[PDB]
Amino acid sequence: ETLNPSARIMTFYPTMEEFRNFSRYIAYIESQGAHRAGLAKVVPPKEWKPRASYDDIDDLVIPAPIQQLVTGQSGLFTQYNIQKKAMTVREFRKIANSDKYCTPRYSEFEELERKYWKNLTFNPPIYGADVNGTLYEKHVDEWNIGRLRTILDLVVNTPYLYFGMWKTSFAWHTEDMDLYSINYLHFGEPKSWYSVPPEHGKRLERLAKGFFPGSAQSCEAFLRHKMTLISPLMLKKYGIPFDKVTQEAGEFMITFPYGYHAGFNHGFNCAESTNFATRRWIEYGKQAVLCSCRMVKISMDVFVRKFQPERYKLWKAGKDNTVIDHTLPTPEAAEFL
Ligand SMILES: [Zn+2]
Ligand SMILES: [Zn+2]
């Protein structure tokens, strides 16, 4: 509780030596209380690059671009997807940068954030989302989203590319199975993020359930449909604590177990993402409320038998009454504490 009491989004600048061990660095940022915010930024060493150039990806296929139709008013919105036929990065970039879809003129991020929440429902953009693949070169061993080699490998552990344009969005959600996530912004215009501290996650859900009663009756985890957009002003009006951060090209974002996040793309960009885990996630995975209507489901037995043997028979019987302390860092953070 003494580390990051404010539960603000923290930014880290590892050296090349510190950067070489992924899992150890996550253990480090947790010892500093980075997890309390639910979101952290890692700016890698200047010399590190996962690929020499991105000039050879014009004919990369985006199998399922999605047109994002948003409906709503007064800070509350629902986003509907319209799957379009496959398109190439070249075709996507032409559309992203055209007069119809390009980023508007602005001076400060605050002005662009205002234009986003003002025009979210107009001129629906296209998101080249969830493309199976990696933009990492084969020889890259540091922070390779393709091969993190965390405890999740015991199994959602494959990489996805997201090609964004101005105003494309990701709705409020937590990772599948309340897992961790890593997001690398390969190139292009920034990506803005909002996060709710895991310790206040239940407050967001209670607010979401109050505003979408129909959705709440149909599903016990309706936010996992990733359709719900709620503005910072609406979170402020209902006392939901949150923080905001802008991710720029060449920066990593780490999301933590039960860390609610949302956000939007400033313009044409490309991000790579995957889920991962630490010993700390096991309890989150066991207690995750899943979409019952409807999805991604990991069997927790293999994790419990290996990392909680003393509790394995107790848990299988439905007697593991363990209550999660969101402020506690991962056990692997011991060497830093
Ligand atoms: Zn996410
Ligand atoms: Zn559902």
Please tell me whether 275 is known to bind a ligand: no
**Other C-beta atoms within 10 Å of 85: how many?**
7
Q: How remote is the C-alpha of 32 from its chain's centroid?
A: 20
Indicate the pairing of strand 180-188 with strand 252-255: antiparallel
What's phi and psi for 250, nearest 5 deg? 85, 15
Q: Are strands 76-83 and 228-230 parallel, antiparallel or unpaired?
A: antiparallel
186 appears as a binding residue in the annotation: no
- Cα-Cα-Cα-Cα torsion 245, 248, 254, 260, nearest 10 degrees, comes to 40
104: DSSP letter? P
Ligand 2 centroid to Cα of residue 331, in Å, is 32
Q: Which ligand does the CA of 295 lie closest to?
A: 2
Q: Is 270 assigned a ligand-binding role in the annotation?
A: no
Resolution (A): 2.2
Q: What domains can you pick out in the chain, each with its CATH number?
A: 9-337 (2.60.120.650)
% helix, strand, coil for the chain, step of 5: 30, 25, 45
Structural contact between residues 180 and 275, judged by C-beta atoms closer than 8 angstroms:
yes
Contact 186, 222 (CB under 8 A): no
Give the CA count within 13 Å in the CB-facing half-sphere of 19: 20
Q: Closest by alpha carbon to 170, among 208, 219, 224?
A: 224
The answer for residues whose C-beta is within 8 angstroms of residue 147's C-beta and 6 or more apart is none
| C-alpha 58 chain-centroid distance | 26
H or E element that contains 202: helix 201-211
Which helix (H) or strand (E) element contains residue 40? Answer: strand 39-42
Query: Distance between CA 182 and CA 274 in Å, rounded?
Result: 6
Do 48 and 16 touch, CB atoms closer than 8 A?
yes
Is residue 226 part of an annotated ligand binding site? yes
How far is residue 184's CA from residue 161's CA, in Å, rounded to a whole number?
Answer: 10
Residues 27, 150: contact at Cβ < 8 Å?
no
Name the nearest CA neighbour of 7 among 327, 332, 333, 337: 327
CA distance 7 to 34: 8
Tell me the ligand closest to 38's alpha carbon: 1
